[PDB]
Amino acid sequence: ASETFEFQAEITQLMSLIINTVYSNKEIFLRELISNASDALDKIRYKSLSDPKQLETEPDLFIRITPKPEQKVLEIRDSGIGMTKAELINNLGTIAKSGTKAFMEALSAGADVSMIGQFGVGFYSLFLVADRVQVISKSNDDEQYIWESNAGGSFTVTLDEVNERIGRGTILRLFLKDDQLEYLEEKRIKEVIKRHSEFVAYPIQLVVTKEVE
Amino acid sequence: ASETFEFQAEITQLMSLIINTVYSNKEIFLRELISNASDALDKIRYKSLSDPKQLETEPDLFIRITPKPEQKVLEIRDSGIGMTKAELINNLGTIAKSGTKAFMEALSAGADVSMIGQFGVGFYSLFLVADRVQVISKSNDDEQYIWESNAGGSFTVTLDEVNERIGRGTILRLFLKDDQLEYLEEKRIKEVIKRHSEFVAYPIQLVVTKEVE
Ligand SMILES: Nc1ncnc2c1ncn2[C@@H]1O[C@H](COP(=O)(O)OP(=O)(O)O)[C@@H](O)[C@H]1O
Numbered sequence: 324a325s326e327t328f329e330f331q332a333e334i335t336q337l338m339s340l341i342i343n344t345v346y347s348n349k350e351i352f353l354r355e356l357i358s359n360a361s362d363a364l365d366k367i368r369y370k371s372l373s374d375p376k377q378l379e380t381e382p383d384l385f386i387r388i389t390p391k392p393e394q395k396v397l398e399i400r401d402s403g404i405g406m407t408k409a410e411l412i413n414n415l416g417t418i419a420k421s422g423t424k425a426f427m428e429a430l431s432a433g434a435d436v437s438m439i440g441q442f443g444v445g446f447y448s449l450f451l452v453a454d455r456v457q458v459i460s461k462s463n464d465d466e467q468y469i470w471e472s473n474a475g476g477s478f479t480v481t482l483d484e485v486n487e488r489i490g491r492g493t494i495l496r497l498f499l500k501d502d503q504l505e506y507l508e509e510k511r512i513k514e515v516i517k518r519h520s521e522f523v524a525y526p527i528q529l530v531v532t533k534e535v536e
Numbered sequence: 537a538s539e540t541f542e543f544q545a546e547i548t549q550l551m552s553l554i555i556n557t558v559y560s561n562k563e564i565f566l567r568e569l570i571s572n573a574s575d576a577l578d579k580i581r582y583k584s585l586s587d588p589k590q591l592e593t594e595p596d597l598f599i600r601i602t603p604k605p606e607q608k609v610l611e612i613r614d615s616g617i618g619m620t621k622a623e624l625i626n627n628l629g630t631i632a633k634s635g636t637k638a639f640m641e642a643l644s645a646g647a648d649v650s651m652i653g654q655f656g657v658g659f660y661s662l663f664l665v666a667d668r669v670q671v672i673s674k675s676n677d678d679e680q681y682i683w684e685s686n687a688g689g690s691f692t693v694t695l696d697e698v699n700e701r702i703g704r705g706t707i708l709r710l711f712l713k714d715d716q717l718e719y720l721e722e723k724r725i726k727e728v729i730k731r732h733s734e735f736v737a738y739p740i741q742l743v744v745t746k747e748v749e
Pocket residue numbers: 359360362363401403404405406414415440442443444445446447493
């Protein structure tokens with residue numbers, strides 16, 4: 324059974340603002356999610372300095388992007404620290420985020436939407452290209468859980484009994500908007516990645532599917 | 537909870553014979569599994585002639601090969617008819633297979649191991665390159681289940697609560713032997729596929745993972 328939680332009011336406002344904005348540089352969402360992925364990998368690496376066993380659940384440290392055309396889904400995965408059930412509820416919704424209102428006010432003043440990451444709310448930039456998202460996470464400290472949101476005022480968290488097992492890490496499963504399907508294309512994904520992410524310490528793997536000739 | 541079943545005696549013998557054989561043309565396993573995949577796709581397509589709704593669980597008809605290096609696993613997937621729990625138990629183990637003893641006798645006489653498919657036991661050719669296998673299947677008529685074998689005399693069947701959801705079809709998850717890791721390599725997989733499978737009516741998709749430069 325899934326559990327439902329209410330988003331902190333300002334986060335709901337931010338999501339409404341982002342999913343509805345006609346901003347032109349929507350591709351910035353990838354830079355933000357890749358940055359969050361890198362941060363998660365930094366955390367597990369750092370924790371492992373004094374607790375090496377933490378790495379054993381998934382020795383490979385990577386960022387992986389997997390387009391799923393049929394389902395019109397784009398997945399951004401990392402083998403970082405991951406999030407326990409409590410962290411998913413805490414970090415992605417119920418607790419007030421310092422930069423939320425600040426960013427919205429900056430936006431009103433004319434600030435570029437690309438500043439979202441500097442305000443600490445880059446995760447929500449995903450709503451620039453997706454109308455729904457499932458965050459699948461496995462922290463060494465908990466079971467695998469699924470957090471899901473459609474930019475509405477509430478989200479759900481469910482023990483994961485339906486997705487592939489993640490050794491450790493997080494998968495941002497984006498259900499792309501009908502007019503943003505270009506982010507399923509290899510060429511497009513490649514140019515966006517090369518553009519705003521040259522100094523990422525981890526390999527960024529793109530999963531490509533080709534018909535054998 | 538998993539359930540354990542005993543293999544029909546002759547199948548156990550066949551598996552022992554195959555996993556231990558020093559045969560040189562081990563690559564034939566791919567041709568056999570791709571053939572079984574094509575057959576499964578033929579079945580759902582045919583059934584759909586009088587029951588079109590059967591296709592809706594997964595409209596795309598394909599064969600997909602996905603190497604998973606870290607886990608030393610190679611997956612062969614199809615969106616065919618799939619197998620219900622009863623079919624997995626029935627079709628892959630507990631029931632006597634007509635060609636089992638016949639093939640073993642042919643083998644003793646000098647027959648090429650590649651004849652395995654003509655005897656109707658091509659599925660077991662997978663033990664030429666793997667010491668363990670999980671068959672994940674989803675038939676429109678049942679839930680998703682996992683059948684698992686290590687070539688021993690018994691196998692297990694478990695309701696699937698750990699793998700990605702298959703719309704419909706089957707995944708042969710092969711845990712490759714340490715000296716057969718060449719089948720994780722794109723170039724190698726490509727040449728084997730092009731060699732013994734030119735007349736397959738369905739697209740054969742290879743999932744490749746590359747680091748973004
Ligand atoms: N890939 C991830 N792995 C682990 N935690 C994440 C991931 N993405 C987001 N989070 C968590 O949820 C929070 C919300 O994301 P975000 O608004 O972008 O925060 P921040 O700007 O501090 O990265 C993060 O602070 C982080 O704790």
